[PDB]
Amino acid sequence: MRTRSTISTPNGITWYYEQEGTGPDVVLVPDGLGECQMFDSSVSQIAAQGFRVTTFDMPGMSRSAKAPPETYTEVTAQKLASYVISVLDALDIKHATVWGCASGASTVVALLLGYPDRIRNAMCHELPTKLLDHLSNTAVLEDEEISKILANVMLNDVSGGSEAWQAMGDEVHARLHKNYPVWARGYPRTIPPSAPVKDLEALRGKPLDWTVGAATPTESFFDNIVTATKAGVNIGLLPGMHFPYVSHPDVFAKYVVETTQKHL
């Protein structure tokens, strides 16, 4: 049975969150769009293997929208790592395996380096380390223009799975619709510079499993592959692109379960 509820943290945030299962903690951190319904299938499938899975909407996004402005403007990996630790504190999760894509990826690595005592192991997928102009320039349009542009980028360019992306349903797309402008304004200018991978030695011998999408163009995350190799970090591929928990839920869960078991 899944817990769906909210919990507030001292930093001003009311987090919407979900929990299923018993066992060691696995925490699924959203990409920038902040929407945890994307993990819904996987939450069950990972739990069914003997884990306790927790996920949540990110500050300012979807049902965690009650939050002060600093938590969704000028966002950095260190801010987000701070927020996440706070919700693990409130939920009394002492030790956690963490997964994260994009700004979640930067976040999980930042958790790993910053809170080594809390983080049993981290999976990072497609960590953004470069300023992208076709993303930053979206922030100075109308909100409704940005929602139209980015709903299309997600759907046709980076879903990795158009049908699956669409099958998430109207409620999810209505929430994402409101997140697109918030994301555009708070994330793509400040997340890349914050990437905690500029120090290779801090990376080395850490329980970190990095992945990039099989179908993503080689240029988008080429730098991830070079970085993980220079630091001896395990680096591999998942099917799809930016959202393997959406396009390939079954392979995603198996991957989380199997990487988790390896570090238990």
Ligand X SMILES: C[C@H]1CCCC(=O)CCC/C=C/c2cc(O)cc(O)c2C(=O)O1
Residues near its own copies (CB under 8 A) = 212-222, 225-226, 229-230, 235, 237
Show the tokens assigned to 179.
Answer: 């997140």
Judged by CB, which is closer to ligand X: 15, or 221? 221
Alpha-carbon distance 96 to 103, whole Å?
18
Judged by CB, which is closer to ligand X: 27, or 91? 27
Taking CB under 6 A as the criterion, the residue among 21, 60, 100, 128 binding ligand X is 128
Contact flag: residue 153 with ligand X (CB under 6 A): yes
Contact flag: residue 161 with ligand X (CB under 6 A): no
153 binds, among its own copies, ligand X, none (CB under 5 to 8 A by kind): ligand X
| Residue 5 CB neighbour total at 10 angstroms | 11
102 binds, among its own copies, ligand X, none (CB under 5 to 8 A by kind): ligand X
Coil, strand or helix: which one is 94? coil
103 binds, among its own copies, ligand X, none (CB under 5 to 8 A by kind): ligand X
Contact flag: residue 242 with ligand X (CB under 6 A): yes
Alpha-carbon distance 128 to 138, whole Å?
17
Spatial strand order of the sheet with 96-101 comes to 3-8, 14-20, 52-56, 25-29, 96-101, 119-125, 208-213, 234-238
Judged by CB, which is closer to ligand X: 51, or 165? 165
Q: Length of the chain in residues, anyone?
A: 264
**CB under 8 Å to 217, separation ≥6 — which residues?**
none
Judged by CB, which is closer to its own copies: 204, or 230? 230
Judged by CB, which is closer to its own copies: 59, or 161? 161
Q: Which residue has the tokens 């960590």?
A: 127
Q: What's the sign of the alpha-carbon dihedral 161, 167, 168, 173? A: positive
CB of 226 to its own copies, least distance (A): 5
Judged by CB, which is closer to ligand X: 21, or 192? 192
183 binds, among ligand X, its own copies, none (CB under 5 to 8 A by kind): ligand X
Taking CB under 6 A as the criterion, the residue among 17, 39, 56, 183 binding ligand X is 183
Coil, strand or helix: which one is 160? coil
38 binds, among ligand X, its own copies, none (CB under 5 to 8 A by kind): none
Alpha-carbon distance 224 to 242, whole Å?
14
Contact flag: residue 211 with ligand X (CB under 6 A): no
Which residue type sits at 244? P
Q: Which residue has the tokens 């409620």?
A: 171
Contacts with ligand X in 19-38 (CB under 6 A)? 31-33
Nearest to 214 by CA among 255, 180, 184: 255
- Residues at the interface with ligand X (CB under 6 A): 31-33, 102-103, 128, 135, 153, 158, 183, 187-188, 191-192, 220, 242
